[model samples]
Target: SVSEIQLMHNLGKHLNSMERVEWLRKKLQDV
Candidate 1:
Protein backbone atom coordinates (compact mmCIF):
# COMPACT_ATOMS: atom_id res chain seq x y z
CA SER A 1 0.00 0.00 0.00
CA VAL A 2 2.83 2.37 0.76
CA SER A 3 4.53 1.83 -2.56
CA GLU A 4 1.29 2.16 -4.44
CA ILE A 5 0.49 5.37 -2.61
CA GLN A 6 4.01 6.69 -3.20
CA LEU A 7 3.88 5.92 -6.90
CA MET A 8 0.51 7.57 -7.24
CA HIS A 9 1.69 10.58 -5.24
CA ASN A 10 4.72 11.10 -7.46
CA LEU A 11 2.76 10.68 -10.62
CA GLY A 12 -0.02 12.97 -9.47
CA LYS A 13 2.32 15.59 -8.08
CA HIS A 14 5.58 15.53 -10.03
CA LEU A 15 5.16 13.67 -13.27
CA ASN A 16 4.36 15.88 -16.26
CA SER A 17 2.53 13.18 -18.15
CA MET A 18 -0.93 14.68 -17.87
CA GLU A 19 -2.73 11.86 -19.65
CA ARG A 20 -1.37 9.10 -17.44
CA VAL A 21 -1.24 11.35 -14.42
CA GLU A 22 -4.95 12.03 -14.56
CA TRP A 23 -5.57 8.40 -15.26
CA LEU A 24 -3.48 7.37 -12.27
CA ARG A 25 -5.25 9.95 -10.13
CA LYS A 26 -8.59 8.35 -10.87
CA LYS A 27 -7.29 4.83 -10.79
CA LEU A 28 -5.37 5.29 -7.54
CA GLN A 29 -8.28 7.12 -5.91
CA ASP A 30 -10.49 4.23 -6.86
CA VAL A 31 -8.11 1.86 -5.07
Candidate 2:
Protein backbone atom coordinates (compact mmCIF):
# COMPACT_ATOMS: atom_id res chain seq x y z
CA SER A 1 0.00 0.00 0.00
CA VAL A 2 1.23 3.50 -0.84
CA SER A 3 0.80 6.22 1.79
CA GLU A 4 1.87 9.70 0.73
CA ILE A 5 0.34 11.39 3.72
CA GLN A 6 2.18 9.21 6.19
CA LEU A 7 5.43 9.68 4.31
CA MET A 8 5.06 13.45 4.47
CA HIS A 9 4.25 13.36 8.15
CA ASN A 10 7.30 11.23 8.88
CA LEU A 11 9.50 13.52 6.84
CA GLY A 12 8.23 16.53 8.72
CA LYS A 13 8.97 14.84 12.05
CA HIS A 14 12.48 13.85 10.94
CA LEU A 15 13.28 17.34 9.74
CA ASN A 16 11.99 18.92 12.92
CA SER A 17 13.95 16.60 15.14
CA MET A 18 17.09 17.14 13.06
CA GLU A 19 16.66 20.87 13.41
CA ARG A 20 16.28 20.51 17.16
CA VAL A 21 19.43 18.42 17.48
CA GLU A 22 21.38 20.90 15.42
CA TRP A 23 20.19 23.72 17.62
CA LEU A 24 21.26 21.86 20.74
CA ARG A 25 24.70 21.08 19.31
CA LYS A 26 25.29 24.72 18.47
CA LYS A 27 24.10 25.79 21.90
CA LEU A 28 26.49 23.37 23.58
CA GLN A 29 29.35 24.46 21.38
CA ASP A 30 28.80 28.06 22.43
CA VAL A 31 28.83 27.13 26.11
TM-score of each: 0.34, 0.35
lDDT (10s digit) by residue, model 2, range 1-31: 4498675455444546577566545645864
Worst 10 residues of 2 by lDDT: 7-16
Evaluate all candidate structures by whole-model CA lDDT and list the values in order.
0.65, 0.56
Candidate 1, poorest ten consecutive residues by summed lDDT: 8-17
lDDT of 2 at 22: 64
Residue clash pairs of candidate 2 = none
